[PDB]
């Protein structure tokens, strides 16, 4: 119950000393993720001063840890708030690291080449340009993109060798700080980055070596924000949260990150709606 | 007086750096708006890069703002002209949003039939030009505009039934056809299935509750690329008030004429002969 989660919420805030106010006003509502992101911030600066991230900003990491915490704390209280998904993430069973050279966009269909990979619905659109039916996926160098996909998968395996399911799925944020209506993409941008130093040079550390690229998520349309987190670090956020919970509680509750299902809802927007400009006048026109 | 507004303008022109050529040529005369439009595009680019138009020619947008500023400059300087209206617009009290399923043309006559047209079109020279291939499609647009306006003016004691409509395009600023811009309903595709419990911005909720908006175009799409949606035209006016209220604090008086149906708006079906210039003193040779 809400009260049940409230107790669990209280504790974490006391232990990791959350500002006297935030805890006093935290009532467990969907928009209340500052105190949660705060308990994580201290626990990090206290128990993990040596966390080196890769293509991730500290704000994004502490932010994400908050979401996954809210998830657990909610899963623990058996609370579901309509029109709200705690994680701000979904699991995309991508099929990019399967057929050599082939990638498949968010639609679950192949990507039409233009070596560049474009979502098939941008057929008319000139390469890196999107239609209102697009999912907003594009890759300049298609090979790199796959290397990044192979990497996250390699990493995922190293961390979970005896998994019965999961190595094909992709943990990915569905909303950046912007959408937490606007034109352009509707989900954080997925961009592959390369690790030149790895090229030369612990199974998970070898993942980056064997596949010198990394999936990085930024803002939807870099409205734009400084959101940035690489996939593997995003996994480590989910993980660190699990441990933080396990340090404070005997059993870890089920937290189901929704599996990604395509929807028009995530379609690239090309047309805007009017937003009124501000006027101090009471009446519209003079008579 | 002329000196005052002439000074208020060169002040606004220098500030937003309009080409010295236009700066000189300007004189607060009836159809001088290029310079003003310029002051407007610059001001927009400088302090409003995030502006976004829905079915509106960018050019059409600064043109309208130019007109509204000209209106202001003129009133401010108290300089009127025998046959000119700076705004180039009128306040049509449309009754198309009041009675469910009812639309009415400029004449003030219900529109008759799927499609709905002017009563004198069951175009005839006694028509106003108004026609709608789909009734609902059309009314959905008229509803939205009322919604947007109510939002932007919640305490408005009067004006939600009116419509800021333009009277001329870059064609008539006689000639055959519709004697004013063409009003054509355009549906808002993405809004159709959007949760109306999104955020606290009501004006957007208007487009959400009524996914389709009125777009004004050329009198006869000689024809021009005049394109501007109802809400953007209202914003043209609003933003000019902003621009002005910044530099002069108190905004002057400026009444946009109210629409009164009259023959000069009837569909023109027959031309009136125009004499071709002849460089002769006498027409014939005997
Ligand atoms: Zn796609
Ligand atoms: Zn963003
Ligand atoms: Zn009529
Ligand atoms: Zn025209």
Curated annotation (Swiss-Prot), chain B:
Plays a role in the elongation phase of viral strand displacement replication by unwinding the template in an ATP-independent fashion, employing its capacity to form multimers. Also enhances the rate of initiation. Released from template upon second strand synthesis. Assembles in complex with viral pTP, viral pol, host NFIA and host POU2F1/OCT1 on viral origin of replication. Covers the whole ssDNA genome during synthesis. The complementary strand synthesis induces its relese from DNA template. May inhibit cellular transcription mediated by the interaction between host SRCAP and CBP. Zn(2+) 1 binds at residues 105, 107, 118, 128. Belongs to the adenoviridae E2A DNA-binding protein family. Zn(2+) 2 binds at residues 169, 171, 218, 224. GO terms for biological process: DNA replication; DNA-templated transcription; positive regulation of DNA replication; viral DNA genome replication; viral DNA strand displacement replication. This is DNA-binding protein. GO terms for molecular function: DNA binding; identical protein binding; single-stranded DNA binding; zinc ion binding. Homomultimerizes on viral ssDNA bound to pTP. Forms a initiation complex with viral polymerase, pTP and hosts NFIA and POU2F1/OCT1. Interacts with host SRCAP. It is found in: Host nucleus. It comes from the Viruses. Keywords: DNA replication, DNA-binding, Early protein, Host nucleus, Host-virus interaction, Metal-binding, Phosphoprotein, Viral DNA replication, Zinc. The C-terminal arm bridges DBP molecules together, thereby creating a chain. One of its GO terms (cellular component) is host cell nucleus. Residues 270-286 are annotated as: C-terminal arm, DBP binding. The modification Phosphotyrosine is found at residue 16. Its main location: host cell.
């Amino acid at each position: 119950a809400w009260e049940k989660g409230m107790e669990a919420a209280r504790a974490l805030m006391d232990k990791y000393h959350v500002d006297n106010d935030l805890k006093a006003n935290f009532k467990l509502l969907p928009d209340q993720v500052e105190a949660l992101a705060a308990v994580c911030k201290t626990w990090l600066n206290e128990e993990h001063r040596g966390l080196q991230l890769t293509f991730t900003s500290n704000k994004t990491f502490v932010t994400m840890m908050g979401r996954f915490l809210q998830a657990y704390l909610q899963s623990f209280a058996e609370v579901t708030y309509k029109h709200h998904e705690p994680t701000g993430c979904a699991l995309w069973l991508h099929r990019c690291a399967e057929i050599e050279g082939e990638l498949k966009c968010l639609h679950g269909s192949i990507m039409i080449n233009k070596d560049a990979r474009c979502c098939v619905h941008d057929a008319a659109c000139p390469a890196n340009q999107f239609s209102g039916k697009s999912c907003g996926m594009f890759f300049s160098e298609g090979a790199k993109a796959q290397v990044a996909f192979k990497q996250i998968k390699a990493f995922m395996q190293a961390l979970y060798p005896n998994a019965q399911t999961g190595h094909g799925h992709l943990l990915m944020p569905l909303r950046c700080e912007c959408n937490s209506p606007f034109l352009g993409r509707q989900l954080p941008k997925l961009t592959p980055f390369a690790l030149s130093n790895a090229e030369d040079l612990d199974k998970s550390v070898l993942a980056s070596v064997h596949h010198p690229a990394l999936i990085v998520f930024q803002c939807c349309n870099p409205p734009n924000c400084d959101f940035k987190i690489s996939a593997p670090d995003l996994l480590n956020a989910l993980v660190m949260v699990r441990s933080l919970w396990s340090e404070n509680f005997t059993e870890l509750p089920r937290m189901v990150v929704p599996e990604f299902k395509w929807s028009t809802k995530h379609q690239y927007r090309n047309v805007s709606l009017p937003v009124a400009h501000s006027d101090a006048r009471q009446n519209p026109f003079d008579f």
